[PDB]
Design a protein around this nucleic acid. Sequence first.
RNA 1: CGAGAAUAGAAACUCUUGAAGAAGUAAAUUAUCUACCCGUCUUGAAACACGGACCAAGGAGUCUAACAUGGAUGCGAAUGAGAAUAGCAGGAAAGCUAUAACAUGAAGAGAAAACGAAAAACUAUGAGAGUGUAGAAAUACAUUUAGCAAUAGUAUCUUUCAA
RNA 2: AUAAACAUACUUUGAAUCGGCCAAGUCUGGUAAGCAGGACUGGCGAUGCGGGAUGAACCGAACGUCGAGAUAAAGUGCCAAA
RNA 3: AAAAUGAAGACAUUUUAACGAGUAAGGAAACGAAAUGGCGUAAGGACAACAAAAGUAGUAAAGAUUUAAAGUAAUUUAGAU
Lengths: 44, 210, 148, 167, 123, 60, 165
Amino acid sequence: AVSNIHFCKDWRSKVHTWFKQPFRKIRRHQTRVEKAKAVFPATI
Amino acid sequence: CKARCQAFRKEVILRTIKNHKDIEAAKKAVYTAKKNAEINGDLYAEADPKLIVAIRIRGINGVSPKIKKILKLLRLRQINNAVFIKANASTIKMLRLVDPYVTYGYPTLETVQKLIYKRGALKINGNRMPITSNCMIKKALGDKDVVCVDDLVHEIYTVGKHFKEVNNKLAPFKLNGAKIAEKNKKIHFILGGGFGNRELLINKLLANMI
Amino acid sequence: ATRFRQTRRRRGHVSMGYGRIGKHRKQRGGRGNAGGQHHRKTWFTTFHPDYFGKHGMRVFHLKANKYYCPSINVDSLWSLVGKDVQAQYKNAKVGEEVPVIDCVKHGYFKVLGKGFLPKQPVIVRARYFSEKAQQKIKAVGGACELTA
Amino acid sequence: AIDLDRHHVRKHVSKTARGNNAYMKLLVRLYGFLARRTQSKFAKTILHRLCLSRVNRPIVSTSKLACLMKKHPEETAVCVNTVTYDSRYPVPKMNVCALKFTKTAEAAITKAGGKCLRFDELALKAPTGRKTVLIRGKRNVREALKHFGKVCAKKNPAKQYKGKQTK
Amino acid sequence: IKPKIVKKYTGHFKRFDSNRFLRVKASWRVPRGIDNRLRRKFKGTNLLPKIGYGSAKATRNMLPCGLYKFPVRNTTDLEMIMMQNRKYAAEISHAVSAKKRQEIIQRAKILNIRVLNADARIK
Amino acid sequence: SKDKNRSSHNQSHKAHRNGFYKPKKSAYMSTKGMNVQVLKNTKAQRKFALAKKLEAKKAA
Amino acid sequence: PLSNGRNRRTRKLFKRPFRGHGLSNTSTILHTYKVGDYVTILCNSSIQHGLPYKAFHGKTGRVWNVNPHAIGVMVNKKVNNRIVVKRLHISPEHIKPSGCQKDFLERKAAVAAIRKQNIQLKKEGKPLLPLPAKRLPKQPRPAELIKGADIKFTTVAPLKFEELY
RNA sequence: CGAGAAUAGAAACUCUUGAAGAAGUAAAUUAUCUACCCGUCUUGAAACACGGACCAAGGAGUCUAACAUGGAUGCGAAUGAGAAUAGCAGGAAAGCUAUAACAUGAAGAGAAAACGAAAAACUAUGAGAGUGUAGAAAUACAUUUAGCAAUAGUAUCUUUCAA
RNA sequence: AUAAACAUACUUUGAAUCGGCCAAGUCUGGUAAGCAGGACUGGCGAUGCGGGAUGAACCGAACGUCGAGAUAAAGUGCCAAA
RNA sequence: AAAAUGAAGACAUUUUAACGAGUAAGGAAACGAAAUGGCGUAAGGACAACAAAAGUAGUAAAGAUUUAAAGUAAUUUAGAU
């Protein structure tokens, strides 16, 4: 199989690790929780 | 239970009696015909031998490709390995192409016996089992009507109708070492060497090699 | 699992499994698919003969949503609704109710004819039909509708 | 030294159930003792096929068992492999015995009136094998087989592992 | 009862070129060099550890006393070989203190178990 | 820096390690390129025997 | 160093037999080759059209297919370490009917003659004949007498040297 | 004279040395035999070929991304759905639940429009399973039945100018 | 005729290698070479051991650790077993 | 390699036979009759006096210098300072 790999360019500076994903889920869930509290038809 | 062992021994005794008749009766007719031919002034032409015993002489290093295959078909895959070979126009020619690696003559009944009694072996289930009984020979060679060890020695000596089946079953004998030559083993026995046809002078070499 | 590699068993070997006469120099014939027509021609000929060249017209902006047309053979039409429903209506005829195997709902547009349908009247509703599919459905005693 | 054609190396035939499946290690113990004692070629055949890798134990769809057991009414099909379901064709009444029955293949066989034996119940019922139809599914249907060889060849090409600039 | 423990080689297989240099330790490492005097098995220097040197299976790992070795850390380990006091001999580990040793040594007398460290860490 | 151009030394003992791979008996039974008249008689009979065989199978 | 020509090294391989020039016979174009016969390829340099490759000259092959003007012949060709199957189409002028099975096809007749008698002797109850003995290499001759009435002797000794000039 | 066979018969010992150190092993020296410098390029190095004064610590096939073959595993015309993302208890960079877009696959060829598979298959060899006879033990023979996998060839069918 | 069930047929994946050298009851260019280039076969390379005092190829013969015996090449005035 | 036996014995079982030199290179882990067998360093999850005080350690750990034993070998164990 003929390889097609686009690593010739710079890639180590074009990486995006997803380590914040466990904490993004919490951050948004603590926004809806604190948005329905203000006025509930806000998050409706 | 074990009353068939008693009856089996009688059959082996009966077969040894009959087997020694063929060897002795054929020996008498050869000598009787030699006396009658001397008296009458005729000449006698002795019959050609039927059995050839070949011994590997050299090692395994430096063998030509075709000669290497002929020795394998003769089952001489090791040095000092003696086998019994049928003699006709083919094996005699095959034993001539590989002469520098074999020495072969003709065995007497006193030599066939010593090799099979002392260095005998059989291939049962693929294992080279040394001969230790007749129930072992009967189990392997019952269908070839060879039930004892004097039936095995007789068939080899006279080259019977079931010689090929008996011959391949016997494993190639592993023999000792002994003085092969007067000069060296690089010249024919005719020139006082080691290899080549030795006729009835192979029994002398096999006597010190068994 | 770096204790399972070949380096852990090839410790003590000087060449490290890469040969003394020809060492493990960096490059062994370019970088990537270099030399496609000069010294690796025996590769792109033995293992990818049609790699080099041009064939076919150019679709400047292909719209892959207009070539989309999943197909279901006739033998698999009855498995959309089930094997219980097939047996329930196994004695139906013309005039009485028969199930409609709406293929478009399940994501199959075309209906092809391959294999054999059970000998029961059946209604098939799908966007496109094959010439030998319609014969197979009709010969069994069914109907072939169209949708959209 | 001795001149031999080739030296003694390991024989390329398996004799145990591979992996650590503590249930497959029992059937081989069970069928490796029935083959030795009964000396029946059916048990040697069953033992031999239980020690084959996954790619050499191809599945037998229920429509293959149906068309193979059409003329064998009272028989117990014996396939040493998984038995899947052919959702396009009906499943008649038959007694089967396999290493693993797929959920829909097990429910379909027993719905029509059949039975789904394991390999322990078969040895108890017919150890030597008396009313069995030995079956094994197709082996050349694998997709990996197409690509083997050189595609450029003139007689039987391969199928050219796809990649860059494919056409 | 004791079978004669027969050894096919009673020496040590020292590393090649360890009697000249100090960076080369006396632990065996088979030479892989092309011109090595030893891996070609030249005469005079042809000593390598080959599986033929392995001692007899019946008397392998057997101490000269005729009993195999069994290490114990506490008095409760002794019970693991209280049935086989004619095959195994206790050997108290080197970390067990001088107080727990007199518990093991005395208990080994009760169960009649030979102990190879009966004079270790004595006062 | 010249070199040895060619030598058949050892090239024949190599080929006899894995011996000459003979062709299978299926290779001697190909029917490609045969007489067009013979291949039309053989096809015209195989169709005739098959039609009478399948009809008998359907009858039973 | 030789060349890559198709018919290279053919000064003595394609030369016609001495006093054998000109036309071929009329049984060359009249023998009937049926599928399955053993024929020998023999390149004929008089007829250039369709001359088989010089590496097949003298090889023995099996007629596999008989075409109106050419006889299909298949032979085994040797490659690097494998033997392949070659399927030529040789005109009858370039091939000769091989008699490799000349001996074999006369042993079959001898056995078939005997087996024909065994189906008659058995029907009429006579003891059936035994099949012919198999072929064996030259066996060691037995012992035979020699009469002393028609005999004569010639002494044999090394010869005294006689000069050749 | 006497094989087989039937019946009767017979093998338990002695001396020397050793807790004053037996046998075995280890260390040093002597004595006969044996022994050229390790690593590497090389057809060939102990080489008058190159690095090496000695010692300690460090020191070189690793990580990610794409494809493929094979060994183990789950499910199987489906598999995955730890795709984002949304909930649960517990406080949790862990654990559980999401009838869910989509990836590979279930259908193949054609540059493309346009299309889209059965004669409910045939032939050959082939894995098994019973029965009886006999050597009489394993095992050999005769006969009824079965056609899986695999290989080759066949009819039939979809697409292509062309299979 | 003889040999062949750890027989026979393979399939998939893959490593190393394509600087070679020597012998000859052989050949070509050369006056000739321990030169250059070849055909068939065995070796050194990749290989120790007994012998040729020493020697990559010569002769014997290819190796797990040993004990006892007949051996092979070749030797039997001393070094040196006879 | 072939037979025998096989829920746990033990030494990776028992019997018979053949075999064992080798640079480059290969033989990943698991696979009861095991589709090669193992030694060592560091870190993580478990197990370690089974009658409710449950691996070793101030009655002297790790380390260092030696002496003996086991293993063909990688190395392990123990005594003394």
